[PDB]
Structure 1
Amino acid sequence: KPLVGTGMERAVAVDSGVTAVAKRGGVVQYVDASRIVIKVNEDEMYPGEAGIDIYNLTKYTRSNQNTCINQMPCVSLGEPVERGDVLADGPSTDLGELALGQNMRVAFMPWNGYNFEDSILVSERVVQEDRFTTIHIQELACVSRDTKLGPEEITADIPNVGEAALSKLDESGIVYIGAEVTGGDILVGKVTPKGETQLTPEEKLLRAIFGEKASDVKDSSLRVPNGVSGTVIDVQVFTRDGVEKDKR
Structure 2
Amino acid sequence: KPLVGTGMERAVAVDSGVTAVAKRGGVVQYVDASRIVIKVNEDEMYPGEAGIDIYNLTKYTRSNQNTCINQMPCVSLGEPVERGDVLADGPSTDLGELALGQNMRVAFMPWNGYNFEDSILVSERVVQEDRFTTIHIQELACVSRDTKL
Q: TM-score category by the smaller chain? A: 0.7 to 0.9
Shift of 1:41: 2.2
**Aligned equivalents of 1:40, 1:111: Cα separation in 2:** 56
Shift of 1:143: 4.3
1:106–1:53: structure 2 CA closer, same or farther, 3 Å change rule? same
The number of residue pairs the alignment matches comes to 148
1:62–1:113: structure 2 CA closer, same or farther, 3 Å change rule? same
Shift of 1:31: 1.1
Deviation digits for residues 96-137 of structure 1 (CA, Å, limit 9, x no counterpart):
111111212022322322232322221323232131112100
Bigger Rg, which one:
1
Structure-1 residue corresponding to 2:74? 74
**Aligned equivalents of 1:20, 1:120: Cα separation in 2:** 35
Q: Which runs of 4+ in 1 moved over 6 A?
A: none
The structure with the greater share of residues assigned to strand is 2
- Percent of aligned positions that are identical: 100
Deviation digits for residues 22-59 of structure 1 (CA, Å, limit 9, x no counterpart):
11121122211110112222332111311111101011
**Aligned equivalents of 2:35, 2:145: Cα separation in 1:** 38
SS in 2 for 1:12: helix
Q: Which ranges of structure 1 fall in alignment gaps of 5 or more residues?
A: 149-248
Deviation digits for residues 189-210 of structure 1 (CA, Å, limit 9, x no counterpart):
xxxxxxxxxxxxxxxxxxxxxx
TM-score normalised to the size of structure 2?
0.87
Q: Confirm or deny: 8 A CA contact 2:25 2:84 kept in the other structure.
A: yes
**Aligned equivalents of 2:79, 2:127: Cα separation in 1:** 36
1:117–1:140: structure 2 CA closer, same or farther, 3 Å change rule? closer
TM-score normalised to the size of structure 1?
0.55
1:142–1:130: structure 2 CA closer, same or farther, 3 Å change rule? closer
Shift of 1:83: 1.3
Q: Which ranges of structure 2 fall in alignment gaps of 5 or more residues?
A: none
